[PDB]
RNA sequence: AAUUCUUGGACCGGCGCAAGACGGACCAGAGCGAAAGCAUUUGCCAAGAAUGUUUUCAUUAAUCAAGAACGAAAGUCGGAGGUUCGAAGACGAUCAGAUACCGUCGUAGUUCCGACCAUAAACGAUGCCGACCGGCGAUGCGGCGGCGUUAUUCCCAUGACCCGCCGGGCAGCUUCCGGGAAACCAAAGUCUUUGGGUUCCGGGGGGAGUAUGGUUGCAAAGCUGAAACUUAAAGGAAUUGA
């Protein structure tokens, strides 16, 4: 194809493309409010953590770091947050 | 073996492989067990085991990677022992031992933000243990003997929410959390526990000071409930006075008079408030409201029972007291409900409640 | 490594024009590329273009009209004196009718015919015909 | 591509367009600076501090929340290490390789990888000398390299 | 066929023992390594590309005279070892002859440790870094999303398949991208419409990688390296014949 709008690409094209090769680069990661059932409180965790985030005063382990995204513990309500 | 310099830097590299994908999970408690059994000196074994002893029983809840599953009889047992070795050393040495200066070492944990909530890290183990036990009861065949074999551990759980209750060096005002955890193992307790230590005629049967220390725990509700009423109505959060008073109402029932109880229900105004509340309390309300008319029935009021127990039994969802019932509508939410299902022994019986709406009418 | 940015930008336009593409995204945007493309537009070889700000070196999307035979660069930037602009425009451009040598002078970035008129020599950037 | 390898890896961080701070974040400029001080005091490098902050607290950049960069904050208060924390890691690596090579003298691969690491030390060391964050006397030589931590 | 081995029991079958090599099939247009090269199990030691990242420093980079590390095989010196194979040798055949191919033995060597050596059709006969320019289906490593099948029965959650996407890597098929003397090549393209950066290096065929000096080596030999003289061709791809 000759005629393609490189200025107005539909958002499925940009979500497909590598994060650096979009028309303006943006992170694939996000922040999410994760709370364990026992406690009352919501602690901010990064998607691709790479540290073992703990609930206050060493209550329990909250997320496990892996190659890509972090494994959140089984029995934890996570709400990814937007700005 | 040296100057707590080779036990604060081997306790700072075995609680560092915690949660990690190559955890080991099992033989990490062994290396936290082989920094106390090869700790045989003062302030190197017989002083500061406390900081290790927090992370020897915290290492036993992490053995299970899931929080929907229960500790095995083996794991459950050893963590009822290791919570008590904590209390062998924190009773007969009255002081704080994750800070609050005495000499120099191995106490004095000031550099670490607050040596007070790492100190308040014992109430959150006996609270985590209080909730951990409930899963042991939720995953047993309740018509099997294996239910009774597990309810024999209820004399051992009620003990530690009492041994770490008397302990008043909080750091009234901030202790009320262990008060609710204590009263929660007293609110559904029956007549012959609460009566047949008052009812053994108080003469030369029960009138010595510590023979009348089995007479502590009939009305433990009188003392500890008002403390979770008029410190908590002064303090920040809500949960431990809504829950506190319904345990009180339910315990002014089935072994005490109606008039004493029904007043408390109308004082707090939970007839027209428990709508914006969370479900975990919204069932304790239903449990209370049902026991009201059941104990009104017990004394004689056989039409006051009727007009109160209508809106509960009217529904096909009369399992707002117990293990939930039938057909589909969002399965993922119905797995957020099997972790709500209240414990079998506590349950108001249903062939007993249908026999008060065809016996009052 | 990427030594010359204008060199990349003009090769990108040239490749896209041959292949018959209608617009092309030349990446590492710079003052020299934009000032080159304005001159190229004012004679009417390219269309209107739109420069895209990420908080870095920007991008440019150039709307291409099929009236561009070649857009090349001369590296290094040789110091073209005014009298020698004849022998340059003799051996670079197709004929004495059309085609332009754009060169960066004291005044600003402008083509050989303007620089000849203003009476200024300068450093050569490239050519377009 | 990579300096001392044939690889051509395209895999790094991609900052968002918006340099603004998010609404949810209640930590202030001075609150983050106070925690940056405490983390560095405990004994931690600018790389680890930034990781621990944005994993646990939710701080995309210190540069967007505060005004300044982490090392810039540390070396104002005076907590910054003497030689930089990238030249430190290259030297410590060279020490560990050279110690392994002392015992395993038949390791010709370890010998070759030591030449690449020490070449990269020399290369980065002189950059810092021109910028004047090392005294011009400064000389990495293997005999008195193990003593530099 | 003979040389050779054997009734002082060879070859063959059985049970043991010792030695020194080598790691079959699985093993692929698969993987790793700067190249040479690298395969039984397990442990220890240090290193590494790729992916992932809303961490950090902020031009620290690309290619390189001098100088330097590694460099199959054969070869050299000293020590240990010598099962198999085997330059020279010794014979047995073959042939007109056979100093060869074929056979029976067989020394240096083949293996390990410590010192030299520095060349190979060391090959992709194809410097390294960067950009742009078609399509398609697989494949190895990492990440991401997704019907369903299956193992942990107790399934959350992990592996094995299944269907796509993104980034690096070994390759493949296809085409009037384009190039080329053609063979062929997504580079060997973007080249008379000739300039992104930089190192090495060729100038008709022989003489000749020869002589001479200098330099490295214990030696073999390596690196640098002409001239007189001789000659109209030598050569590369492709076509038709024989």
Curated annotation (Swiss-Prot), chain A:
PROSITE patterns: RIBOSOMAL_S27E. Residues 1-15 have a biased composition (Basic and acidic residues). The gene is RPS27. A zinc finger (C4-type) spans 36-58. Keywords: Cytoplasm, Metal-binding, Nucleus, Phosphoprotein, Ribonucleoprotein, Ribosomal protein, Zinc, Zinc-finger. The modification Phosphoserine is found at residue 10. InterPro entries: Ribosomal_eS27, Ribosomal_eS27_Zn-bd_dom_sf, Ribosomal_zn-bd. Belongs to the eukaryotic ribosomal protein eS27 family. This is Small ribosomal subunit protein eS27. Residues 1-22 are annotated as: Disordered. One of its GO terms (cellular component) is cytosolic small ribosomal subunit. Component of the small ribosomal subunit. The ribosome is a large ribonucleoprotein complex responsible for the synthesis of proteins in the cell. Required for proper rRNA processing and maturation of 18S rRNAs. Part of the small subunit (SSU) processome, first precursor of the small eukaryotic ribosomal subunit. Component of the small ribosomal subunit. Part of the small subunit (SSU) processome, composed of more than 70 proteins and the RNA chaperone small nucleolar RNA (snoRNA) U3. GO terms for biological process: ribosomal small subunit biogenesis; rRNA processing; translation. Binds 1 zinc ion per subunit. It comes from the Eukaryota. Its cofactor is Zn(2+). Zn(2+) binds at residues 36, 39, 55, 58. It is found in: Cytoplasm; Nucleus, Nucleolus. GO terms for molecular function: structural constituent of ribosome; zinc ion binding.
UniProtKB/Swiss-Prot annotation, chain C:
It is found in: Cytoplasm; Nucleus, Nucleolus. The modification N6-succinyllysine is found at residue 87. GO terms for biological process: translation. Keywords: Cytoplasm, Nucleus, Ribonucleoprotein, Ribosomal protein. It comes from the Eukaryota. Component of the small ribosomal subunit. Part of the small subunit (SSU) processome, first precursor of the small eukaryotic ribosomal subunit. During the assembly of the SSU processome in the nucleolus, many ribosome biogenesis factors, an RNA chaperone and ribosomal proteins associate with the nascent pre-rRNA and work in concert to generate RNA folding, modifications, rearrangements and cleavage as well as targeted degradation of pre-ribosomal RNA by the RNA exosome. Required for proper erythropoiesis. Belongs to the universal ribosomal protein uS8 family. This is Small ribosomal subunit protein uS8. The lineage of its organism: Eukaryota, Metazoa, Chordata, Craniata, Vertebrata.
From Swiss-Prot, chain D:
The modification N6-succinyllysine is found at residues 26, 33. This is Small ribosomal subunit protein uS15. It holds the Pfam family Ribosomal_S13_N. Signal peptide: none annotated. HAMAP family: Ribosomal_uS15_A. The modification N6-acetyllysine is found at residue 26. The gene is RPS13. NCBIfam families: PRK08561.1. Its main location: cytoplasm. PANTHER family: RIBOSOMAL PROTEIN S15P/S13E, SMALL RIBOSOMAL SUBUNIT PROTEIN US15. PROSITE patterns: RIBOSOMAL_S15. The lineage of its organism: Eukaryota, Metazoa, Chordata, Craniata, Vertebrata. Keywords: Acetylation, Cytoplasm, Isopeptide bond, Nucleus, Phosphoprotein, Ribonucleoprotein, Ribosomal protein, Ubl conjugation. It comes from Oryctolagus cuniculus (Rabbit). GO terms for molecular function: small ribosomal subunit rRNA binding; structural constituent of ribosome. Ubiquitinated at Lys-26 by RNF14 and RNF25 in response to ribosome collisions (ribosome stalling). Component of the small ribosomal subunit. Part of the small subunit (SSU) processome, composed of more than 70 proteins and the RNA chaperone small nucleolar RNA (snoRNA) U3. GO terms for biological process: translation. Component of the small ribosomal subunit. The ribosome is a large ribonucleoprotein complex responsible for the synthesis of proteins in the cell. Part of the small subunit (SSU) processome, first precursor of the small eukaryotic ribosomal subunit. During the assembly of the SSU processome in the nucleolus, many ribosome biogenesis factors, an RNA chaperone and ribosomal proteins associate with the nascent pre-rRNA and work in concert to generate RNA folding, modifications, rearrangements and cleavage as well as targeted degradation of pre-ribosomal RNA by the RNA exosome. Belongs to the universal ribosomal protein uS15 family.
């Amino acid at each position: 194809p000759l005629a393609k709008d490189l200025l107005h690409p539909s958002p499925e094209e940009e979500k497909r493309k590598h994060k650096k090769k979009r028309l303006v680069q943006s992170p694939n990661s996000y922040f999410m409010d994760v709370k364990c059932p026992g406690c009352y409180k919501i602690t901010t965790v990064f998607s691709h953590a790479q540290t073992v985030v703990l609930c206050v005063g060493c209550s329990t382990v909250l997320c496990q770091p892996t190659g890509g995204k972090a494994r959140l513990t089984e029995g934890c309500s996570f709400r990814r947050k937007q700005h | 073996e040296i100057t707590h310099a080779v036990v604060i830097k081997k306790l700072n590299e075995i609680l560092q492989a915690r949660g990690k994908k190559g955890t080991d999970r099992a033989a990490q408690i062994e290396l936290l067990q082989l920094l106390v059994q090869i700790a045989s000196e003062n302030n190197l074994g017989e002083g500061v085991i406390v900081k290790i002893k927090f992370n020897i029983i915290a290492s036993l809840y992490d053995y299970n990677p899931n929080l929907a599953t229960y500790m095995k009889p083996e794991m459950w047992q050893k963590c009822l022992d290791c919570i008590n070795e904590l209390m062998d050393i924190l009773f007969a040495n009255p002081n704080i031992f994750v800070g609050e200066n005495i000499l120099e070492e191995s106490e004095n944990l000031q550099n670490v933000d607050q040596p007070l909530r790492v100190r308040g890290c014992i109430l959150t183990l006996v609270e985590r243990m209080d909730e951990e036990f409930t899963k042991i009861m939720q995953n047993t065949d309740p018509h099997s003997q294996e239910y009774v074999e597990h309810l024999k551990d209820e004399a051992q759980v009620c003990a530690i929410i009492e041994r770490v209750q008397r302990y008043l060096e909080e750091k009234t005002e901030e202790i009320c959390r262990v008060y609710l955890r204590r009263i929660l193992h007293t609110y559904y307790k029956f007549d012959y526990k609460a009566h047949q230590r008052q009812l053994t005629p108080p003469e030369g049967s029960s009138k010595s000071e510590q023979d009348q220390a089995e007479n502590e725990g009939e009305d433990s509700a009188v003392l500890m409930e008002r403390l979770c009423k008029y410190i908590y109505a002064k303090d920040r959060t809500d949960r431990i006075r809504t829950c506190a008073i319904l345990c009180h109402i339910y315990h002014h029932a089935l072994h005490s008079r109606w008039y004493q109880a029904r007043d408390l229900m109308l004082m707090s105004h939970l007839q027209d408030n428990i709508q914006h509340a969370d479900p975990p309390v919204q069932i304790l309300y239903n449990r209370t409201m049902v026991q009201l008319g059941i104990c009104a029935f017990r004394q004689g009021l056989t039409k006051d029972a009727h007009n109160a127990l209508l809106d509960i039994q009217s529904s096909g969802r009369a399992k707002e007291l117990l293990g939930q019932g039938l057909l589909l509508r969002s399965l993922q939410e119905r797995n957020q409900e099997q972790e709500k299902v209240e414990r079998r022994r506590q349950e108001p019986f249903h062939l007993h409640i249908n026999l008060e709406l065809l016996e009052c009418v | 490594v990427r030594m010359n940015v204008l060199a990349d930008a003009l090769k990108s336009i040239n490749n896209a024009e041959k292949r018959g593409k209608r617009q092309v995204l030349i990446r590492p945007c710079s003052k020299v590329i934009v000032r080159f493309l304005t001159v190229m537009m004012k004679h009417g070889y390219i269309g209107e273009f739109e420069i895209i700000d990420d908080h870095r070196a920007g991008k440019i999307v150039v709307n291409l009209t099929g009236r561009l035979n070649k857009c090349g660069v001369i590296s290094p930037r040789f110091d073209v004196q005014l009298k020698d602009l004849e022998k340059w425009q003799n051996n670079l451009l197709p004929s004495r009718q059309f085609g332009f040598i754009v060169l960066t002078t004291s005044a600003g970035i402008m083509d050989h015919e303007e620089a000849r008129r203003k009476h200024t020599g300068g450093k050569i950037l490239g050519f377009f015909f | 591509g990579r300096m001392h390898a044939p690889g051509k890896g395209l895999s790094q961080s991609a900052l968002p367009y918006r340099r603004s701070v998010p609404t949810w974040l209640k930590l202030t400029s001075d609150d983050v600076k106070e925690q940056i001080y405490k983390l560095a005091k405990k004994g931690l490098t600018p790389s680890q501090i930034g990781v621990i902050l944005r994993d646990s607290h939710g701080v995309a950049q210190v540069r967007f929340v505060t005004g300044n960069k982490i090392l810039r904050i540390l070396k104002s208060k005076g907590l910054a290490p003497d030689l930089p924390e990238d030249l430190y890691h290259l030297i410590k690596k060279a020490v560990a390789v050279r110690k392994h090579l002392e015992r395993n003298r038949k390791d010709k691969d370890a010998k070759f990888r030591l030449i690449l690491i020490e070449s990269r030390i020399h290369r980065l060391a002189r950059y810092y000398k021109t910028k004047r964050v090392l005294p011009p006397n400064w000389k990495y030589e293997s005999s008195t390299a193990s003593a530099l931590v």
